[PDB]
Amino acid sequence: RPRYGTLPVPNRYYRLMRSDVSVCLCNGCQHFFIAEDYEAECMRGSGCPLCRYRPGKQVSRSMKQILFDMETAAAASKTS
Amino acid sequence: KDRDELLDRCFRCNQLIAQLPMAGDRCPNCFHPCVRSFVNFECLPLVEFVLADELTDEEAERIIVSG
């Protein structure tokens, strides 16, 4: 399902015939990856290597993290 | 003499890719675009098929769930 936004774009369909290869699809990006390779690349602390999608949380994050980051920046300014 | 293990395989035409692919990274034989991974860029065993005009994506999901 091409996530271009709210625009109507038809869903493309693919057939898999050789089950010995593990494939996955990053929901934030909708690009195909090798599942183990995508999992290994996700550990670099930026989610999907392309779209930086992180599962387990909705599209709108907890933006209070930015407020705590600015708090920590002020703290590092006021260390010395 | 090129090795066959490092050559891309087009699963739609069931034939290897020896020549340089054309624009769109399509198959030289059957013009099929390569369904590639986006870490190592390996042609995954996936073929692309579009529904007929009498079927829709909602109907495709309905018939996928039903049978």
Place this chain on the structure above:
Amino acid sequence: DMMQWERALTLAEQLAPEEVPIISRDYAQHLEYRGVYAKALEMYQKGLRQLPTGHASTELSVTVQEVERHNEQCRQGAARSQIRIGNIADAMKTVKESSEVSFVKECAKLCEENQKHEEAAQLYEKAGDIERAATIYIERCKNLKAAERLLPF
């Protein structure tokens, strides 16, 4: 940007078959400003294009309106150009099958100069104004039978 639309078409024969008519229409537009549009008919006839066949999604749906608008504009240009050639009878079907008031008004002006007063009379009453139509009737056409129907108005 060279305005050598002839060689643009020539290379578009093998490069981009679909781009062929559009440039063509633009060519005719420039001829519109110089009065040399006597050759500006064959590209309008070549502007036809087969319908996009495919799935019934929006992608095959939106483009239909744009390509049909291009066809309507091309037929408008063809009807405008056919007046001075002397093919009023062929253009009359397209004009009377149209709806646009301004296009019919612009087409109606030039029919009198070719002494084709019947088609001019047909277009004047549907041009949106009856006072000027009757003024042309009594001064040039002198056709009282058509003016009788316009007497109460």
